[PDB]
């Protein structure tokens, strides 16, 4: 099995895991902080997706240190996995172009 596609799938699974655990840990870290909105699991998961995609709707964000740390982990997981998919596509296209020219 090709390495780039394997790492791509691994980053997909790992990203899903980081999204779910990030929602759970976000709710756990944010409850107890007055004014916090990241306190229900469904919209904590929605916020996890927003964070991993950096879509920037700005409707939900953590206010505590540990919630912000969880947030950073989700950000870096999304940036890393999506950049990994980009790199895998690059490797694929370079292979197909290398065969297209008979080299």
């Amino acid at each position: 099995s090709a390495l780039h596609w394997r790492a791509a799938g691994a980053a997909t699974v790992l990203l899903v895991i980081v999204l779910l655990a990030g929602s759970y840990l976000a709710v756990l870290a944010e409850r107890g902080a007055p004014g916090a909105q990241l306190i229900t699991y469904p919209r904590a998961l929605w916020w996890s997706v927003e964070t991993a995609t950096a879509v920037g709707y700005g409707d939900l964000y953590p206010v505590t240190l540990w919630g912000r740390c969880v947030a950073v982990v989700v950000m870096v997981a999304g940036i890393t996995s999506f950049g990994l998919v980009t790199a895998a596509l690059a490797t694929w296209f370079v292979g197909r172009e290398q065969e297209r020219r008979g080299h």
Partner: antibody, heavy 118, light 108 residues
Framework: QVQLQQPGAELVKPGASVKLSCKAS????????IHWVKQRPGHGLEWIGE????????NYNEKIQKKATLTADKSSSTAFMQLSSLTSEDSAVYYC???????????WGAGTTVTVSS | DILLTQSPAILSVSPGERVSFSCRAS??????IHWYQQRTNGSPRLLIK???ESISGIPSRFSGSGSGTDFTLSINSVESEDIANYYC?????????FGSGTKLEIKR
């Protein structure tokens, strides 16, 4: 079956303490939170605090004088609220309730009538 | 924290008429409002979740409406068993808070 089992009454002496119990049944999840709500006779509902049994983290209402300490035994599926140094201002019905993680109480216990008197 | 004002505190209606309880929040909270019913010496019973979503086992004459800061619990054709106290619990920001409650009376 009744999902949350609470004792009917507890008699406390002024200055003493009491540990209220809340035994769970039905569907339990790692995402479950158990809340405790205070209702003095004739008054409304007052949120006391919450605990996530699968983790043990508990949060309390900041605006009131902290008299409670929340714990949970995971094997017996039981939530405990320890009220300490009780004044006549603490005589009330104390409910426990379960919350799947949406922020509303789907099921409540029958409530424990706490009377602090000599 | 988020304050929930339930006014009036007492609502008196005739049997069979439509009644509406009001619940106003001190800040915008979307639809994160839930409604409970407590009869005399009873435990609170969830009637409506998320301002308008139905609960299984609750009579269909119970409905909810509103969003932001103004919410309404409505009963079509009030009857004797509807006599109770009604609370509107909020859960948009920590900590969760309750309204002060509205008692429903029936003039028979």
């Amino acid at each position: 079956q009744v999902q949350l089992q609470q004792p009917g009454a507890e008699l406390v002496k002024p200055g003493a303490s009491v540990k209220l119990s809340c035994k769970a049944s039905g569907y339990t999840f790692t995402s479950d939170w158990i809340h405790w709500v205070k209702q003095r006779p004739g008054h409304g509902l007052e949120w006391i605090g919450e605990i996530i049994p699968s983790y043990g983290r508990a949060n309390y209402n900041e605006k009131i004088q902290k008299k409670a300490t929340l714990t949970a035994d995971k094997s017996s599926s039981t939530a405990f609220m320890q009220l300490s140094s009780l004044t006549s201002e603490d005589s009330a019905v104390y409910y426990c309730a379960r919350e799947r993680g949406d922020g509303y109480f789907a099921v409540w216990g029958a409530g424990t009538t706490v009377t602090v008197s000599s | 924290d988020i304050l929930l004002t339930q006014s009036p505190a007492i609502l008196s209606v005739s049997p069979g008429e439509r009644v509406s309880f009001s619940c106003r929040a001190s800040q915008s909270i979307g639809t994160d409002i839930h409604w409970y019913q407590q009869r005399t010496n009873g435990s609170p019973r969830l009637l409506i979740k998320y301002a308008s979503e139905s609960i299984s086992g609750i009579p269909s004459r119970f409905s909810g409406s509103g969003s932001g800061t103004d919410f309404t619990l409505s009963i079509n054709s009030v009857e004797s068993e509807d006599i109770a106290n009604y609370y509107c619990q909020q859960s948009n920001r920590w900590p969760f808070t309750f309204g002060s409650g509205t008692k429903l009376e029936i003039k028979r």
